[PDB]
Design a protein around this ligand. Structure first.
Ligand SMILES: O[C@@H]1[C@@H](O)[C@H](O[C@@H]2CO[C@@H](O)[C@H](O)[C@H]2O)OC[C@H]1O
Length: 324
């Protein structure tokens, strides 16, 4: 059961940015304590999985929006904004996209994969616009997700193999044509470490924006660890922000590296407090901070872990009190 009278987390950040959370459609019932935590603490929602490509078009032309729409309906009922995650990724994308349908042993061509990408993006955005209209809570989408490799080169996914390097710009062109009201993000992890991947993200967005690609923001997943360096996160935000794009912290959680001891929870609280002081100091660039999961027991990280502000019994952790 949850603590009903402690401060609503997002309210602490009302003069800075919305505070959101990634959710599962099965955790939205009024009587479910995970749903109660969700509605109490967050004013922004993201689908952890229900808006991924496999979750929306499992076989070609067969769109499955029920779970996504359940999350959208809940966001509307709770006066929450949403982020759309995600139109393109190398995981949770059905194999049919990349196969020649007359010979599935062969790859789809560049033109066929681009047409499929355009149809998927346009159908997904037109679905939310036609079903929800002005009540659509989605303010923007992760148009492409994790397109860089660990060394900063373009990840050699099937999108890159079949189409080539301009598949990224094409995804943004298709999204922008389908719904110009959406803010369009490129989203990625490890770009907060101020290493070669941060520099490659800055170089890629600088290039594409100079070419007129409609990229409005960079999503910094921020799957950080208890050993992450705040100075490096601050230098990465400053570098990426110099491109004149919005920054959103999209999938925040903290990998404890197997140490869930009380001492580690106190170290986590100090690090989360430093991180949120940094986000508040960079409020001129940051337009949303979203946590990747409601509470530790539903985190995607393998066990043992304690990555979030609410523990495995849904109680506020030292980190929650340090930030509020
Ligand atoms: O439920 C799990 C999700 O939490 C997980 O979400 C991904 C985490 O890695 C990030 O790079 C991705 O952007 C994000 O979608 O996906 C796997 C799923 O089983």
């Amino acid at each position: 059961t949850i603590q009903n009278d402690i401060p609503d987390l997002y309210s602490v950040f009302k003069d800075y940015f919305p505070i959101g959370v990634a959710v599962d459609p099965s955790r939205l019932n009024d009587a479910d304590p995970h749903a109660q935590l969700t509605a109490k603490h967050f004013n922004m929602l993201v689908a952890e999985n229900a808006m991924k490509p496999e979750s929306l078009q499992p076989t070609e032309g067969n769109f499955t929006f029920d779970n996504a729409d359940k999350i959208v309906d809940y966001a509307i009922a709770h006066n929450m904004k949403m982020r759309g995650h995600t139109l393109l990724w190398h995981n949770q994308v059905p194999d049919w996209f990349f196969q020649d349908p007359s010979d599935p042993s062969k790859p789809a061509s560049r033109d066929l994969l681009l047409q499929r990408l355009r149809t998927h993006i346009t159908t997904v955005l037109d679905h939310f616009k036609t079903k929800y209209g002005s009540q659509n809570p989605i303010i923007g989408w992760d148009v492409v997700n994790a397109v860089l490799d660990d060394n900063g080169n373009l990840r050699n996914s099937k999108w890159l193999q079949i189409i080539g390097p301009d598949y990224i710009e094409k995804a943004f062109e298709y999204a922008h044509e389908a719904d110009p009201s959406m803010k369009l993000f490129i989203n990625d992890y490890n770009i907060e470490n101020n290493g070669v991947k941060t520099q490659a993200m800055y170089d890629l967005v600088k290039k594409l924006k100079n070419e007129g690609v409609p990229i409005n923001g960079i999503g910094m997943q921020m799957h950080i660890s208890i050993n992450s360096n705040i100075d490096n996160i601050k230098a990465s935000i400053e570098k990426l922000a110099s491109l004149g794009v919005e920054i959103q912290v999209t999938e925040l959680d903290m990998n404890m590296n197997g140490d869930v001891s009380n001492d580690a929870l106190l170290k986590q609280a100090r690090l989360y407090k430093q991180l949120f002081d940094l986000f508040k100091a960079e409020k001129q660039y940051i337009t949303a901070v979203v946590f990747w999961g409601v509470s530790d027991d539903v985190s995607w990280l393998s066990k043992p872990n304690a990555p979030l502000l609410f523990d495995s019994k849904l109680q506020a952790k030292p980190a929650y009190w340090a930030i509020v």
